[PDB]
Every structure is written in structure tokens, then in C-alpha cells.
């Protein structure tokens, strides 16, 4: 879940201004162009902050997006609406720069998406811009910039 459902017990201290962005609720990209192409698709599971691939059902229902990668990669999920179950997807043709889920790494390392939509060290897709940041016991995020597919 992008937004922690469990309520906090204390008011936060809005005094500092540094290192207040390394949270899983941060949606979108750190640097965003006004000329970016944005799509929304039905979400299969929870692909938030993961690479997505197109999955077709039996034809009765339209296509949906599922967390995945490899040669089937279609885009990167940057946002998700839980009420409507719609996942915001930026196509692989467009370039994206932001925080993405990392497989549980130093800046400059070339990263490719795995079967579960998680970035991993080495075709390449993106380059690590920072080191792994640990949010939960198994949740690791990383600032990466994706520039498409290139061998």
C-alpha cells in the first residue's frame, strides 16, 4: 500500500527540510516534464513502483497491467488509485526518472527489470543514481532514470 493505512499516533515535526522524500508514499517522478505521456490501465495485483507488462485475459475482459519485466516490459507504474484500481503507467518509449523498487548497488550501475518488476544489477534499461534505501525489511527503493531498452 502506497499510503500507510495504519494511523500514526503522533504529530510529525515540520521543522527539518532534509531527507523527507525517502518514503513509499512519494508518487510520480522527482523531475517531471509537462510533455510526458501518461496512461491508466486496470491493475492486476499491486504493481506500484514496479515495471509492468501487458496481460490479456480470455477476451471477455479488456487487457490489464501486471508487475513484470524481461522482454515483455511495457512501462513503469508511477502511481495507483486504490478506489478505482487504476495504475498510472509511463510507457517504455518515454523516459522516467524517480524512485523504483529494487531487488533485495552503487550509483552508475546498470539495472534491468526482473520477472517481478524489480530492478536488479546486470539488455539494460536504467542506471542507478543513488544507493539502496531500506524502507521495510524487504522493501528497498532506489533513485533510477529509465531511458528505454538498449543492448
Amino acid at each position: 500500500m502506497k499510503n500507510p493505512q495504519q494511523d500514526s499516533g503522533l504529530l510529525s515535526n515540520s521543522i527539518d527540510f532534509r531527507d523527507q522524500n525517502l518514503i513509499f508514499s512519494n508518487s510520480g517522478g522527482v523531475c517531471t516534464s509537462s510533455k510526458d505521456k501518461i496512461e491508466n490501465y486496470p491493475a492486476k495485483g499491486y504493481p506500484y513502483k514496479r515495471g509492468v507488462k501487458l496481460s490479456f485475459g480470455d477476451g471477455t475482459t479488456e487487457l490489464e497491467v501486471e508487475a513484470g519485466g524481461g522482454d515483455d516490459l511495457y512501462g513503469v507504474c508511477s502511481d495507483i488509485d486504490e478506489f478505482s484500481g487504476m495504475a498510472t503507467v509511463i510507457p517504455i518509449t518515454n523516459n522516467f526518472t524517480g524512485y523504483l523498487t529494487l531487488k533485495k548497488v552503487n550509483p552508475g550501475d546498470k539495472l534491468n527489470f526482473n520477472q517481478h518488476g524489480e530492478l536488479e544489477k546486470v539488455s539494460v534499461n536504467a542506471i542507478a543514481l543513488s544507493k539502496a534505501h531500506k524502507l521495510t525489511e524487504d522493501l528497498f527503493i532506489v533513485l533510477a532514470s529509465v531511458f528505454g531498452n538498449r543492448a
Binding site: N3, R18, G28, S34
Partner: protein, 313 residues
């Protein structure tokens, strides 16, 4: 204008609720002057003279005389323009998000324009205050991955050619050793004819609590702060010596005068955050806005600022 653009009207109504920056306490009213420049540079010239050799004795006939040299120095100040973008809710979209006691999509982190703008202004002003003191721009608490800036852009802590003192690790908690280094820096200060001026001290909270202890048996009715004020009063011709605390500093002591002649602050008239006219719009309810701010304009004479670093471990 307000009739055509609601965002301009909203900002004009919300601008009065933004707190003044804390850096104003760090300068005298005369030390700050507004310049009308957005991005570019401003230059000034200073003329100096010097003696090349010992004076020549005027005895009998002589043609070879000692010379007095001159030199010019050109001082350049750099100004940079920076910008942020922030998302918010469309103006004609609030009624479909007004809750019982609040407005905005909690699940998706969307706000009305007024609240989003106010929060954005406060964060930027904090960033500006950090740069004026430390001379750098960075969002990490480690002060790494800094934004590469232009030369001739310095703050009160990274200014070159100043007196710098370092308290060793073994004396991190020994107030006498810390006060020792302060005196050595005070001696090396070179105020000269501008001695008769108020002085300003900025210290981290950890060291500030060390100051309030009584001076050391212990001298009753005498604190380390009182001793320090008198010591500074020795060289400033018995002028006011103010002390301030800032959480931005960490194991750092900064002493500098409040004289416009020695240290001058010439920020741009558009340094503080300002709305941009461009507003991204789409068919959905999410719009984007831009805020502009300008950095730079700190000028100070060399060897007039004392920087004490208490090396922790």
C-alpha cells in the same frame, strides 16, 4: 487581473501567512540592500597601495629612489535563478473534494492551491536560509550530492580567506580548550579601523548549553557566556555583542561583525519565492504550478570572519 486569474488572487490572500526568514536576525538593517537582477553578475573595483622597499635616504645626490606600488582588484558577485514545480487541485474541482473539516484527497496526497503554495514557500525559504549560512545547496542531511553552483557564490561558513580554528577530538567537551581556540581566532582577526561596530555570534545548540555553565572552583555570578562577551568587547570598542543559536550549525562557532563596510549582503529583489504565470492544465483535476527564487549576493572582506570547528571524534 484577479478576475481573470484566480491563482493570483489566491496567492495575494495567502502570502501574508508566510513567516519571515530567520536569516534577517543575522544581519543589521543597513547590511542588506536590494539589487534589481534576476540572473547574471555584478562587479566592483577596489584600489590598494603598497610599499616596495625601505625608504631612501636623501643625502647628497641620488637618482635611484624606492617605489610605492599600486594594485587593482575586481570583485564579482554571481546570481542564479532556480525553480520548483508542484502539483495541486484544479480550482473548479474543490467542491468534489471538500470533506467535513478539510479539503483534499488524503489517499492520493492532493491539496488546494492555497495550502500547496504555502507549504511550498516555507520549504524553499528553509532552503534559502540554509544556503545563506552554509553556502551550499543540498537536500540530504549528509550534505552530499550538492547542486553544482557558479563561483563567486559563497555563504557565511564557506567563505575563503578567513580565520579557521579546529578544536581537537580529545577536547570536544572541555570548555576551556574551546574558549582557548576562540581567543586565538579573535587575536588573528583584522577588523582594523572598523573595530567600533556591533558583533554577532552564531553557535550550535550543543555548544550553547556549554556556554551557560558558570565560568571556571567556579566563579559565582560569572558564566562562560559572560567571559566570552567581555573578550569580544575588548576588540569591538565595547559595543553590543549578540549571540544567536541555529540548529543548522553543527559543532560550529561563527563570529563576524555587523558593519556594512566589512560584510555586505546584496540579494536580488526576487530572491524570495515568487509565483510563475505558467500553469499546467489538463482534462483531469490535477494542475501544476511553478515557483521561482534567486540565490546569491553575499560580499565580505577577507580575514574578518572566525570559523571554529569542534572536531567530534
Amino acid at each position: 487581473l484577479f478576475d481573470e486569474n484566480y491563482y493570483a488572487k489566491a496567492v495575494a490572500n495567502i502570502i501574508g501567512e508566510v513567516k519571515d526568514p530567520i536569516m534577517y536576525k543575522w544581519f543589521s538593517p543597513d547590511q542588506i540592500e536590494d539589487v534589481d537582477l534576476q540572473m547574471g553578475y555584478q562587479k566592483t573595483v577596489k584600489w590598494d597601495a603598497f610599499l616596495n622597499a625601505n625608504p631612501t635616504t636623501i643625502a647628497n645626490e641620488v637618482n635611484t629612489i624606492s617605489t610605492i606600488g599600486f594594485s587593482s582588484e575586481v570583485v564579482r558577485l554571481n546570481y542564479l535563478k532556480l525553480q520548483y514545480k508542484f502539483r495541486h487541485l484544479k480550482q473548479t474541482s474543490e467542491k468534489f473534494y471538500t470533506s467535513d473539516s478539510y479539503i483534499g484527497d488524503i489517499n492520493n496526497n492532493l491539496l488546494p492551491f492555497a495550502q500547496a503554495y504555502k507549504l511550498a514557500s516555507s520549504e524553499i525559504i528553509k532552503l534559502i536560509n540554509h544556503f545563506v549560512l552554509t553556502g551550499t545547496v543540498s537536500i540530504q542531511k549528509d550534505g552530499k550530492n550538492q547542486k553544482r553552483l557558479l563561483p563567486n557564490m559563497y555563504g557565511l561558513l564557506n567563505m575563503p580567506e578567513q580565520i579557521k580554528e579546529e578544536v581537537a577530538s580529545g577536547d570536544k567537551d572541555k570548555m576551556d580548550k574551546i574558549f582557548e581556540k576562540i581567543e586565538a581566532g579573535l587575536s588573528k582577526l583584522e577588523l582594523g579601523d572598523e573595530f567600533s561596530t556591533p558583533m554577532m555570534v552564531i553557535v550550535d545548540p550543543a555548544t550553547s548549553l556549554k556556554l551557560v555553565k558558570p565560568y571556571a572552583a567556579a566563579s559565582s555570578c560569572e558564566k562562560w557566556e559572560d567571559v566570552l562577551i567581555q573578550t569580544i568587547k575588548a576588540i569591538n570598542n565595547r559595543e553590543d555583542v549578540y549571540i544567536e543559536t541555529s540548529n543548522l550549525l553543527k559543532h560550529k562557532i561563527l563570529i563576524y561583525p555587523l558593519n556594512s563596510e566589512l560584510i555586505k549582503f546584496k540579494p536580488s529583489k526576487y530572491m524570495l519565492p515568487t509565483p510563475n504565470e505558467q500553469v499546467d492544465k489538463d482534462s483531469t483535476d490535477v494542475a501544476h504550478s511553478y515557483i521561482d527564487f534567486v540565490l546569491g549576493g553575499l560580499l565580505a572582506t577577507r580575514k574578518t570572519i572566525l570559523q571554529v570547528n569542534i572536531k567530534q571524534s
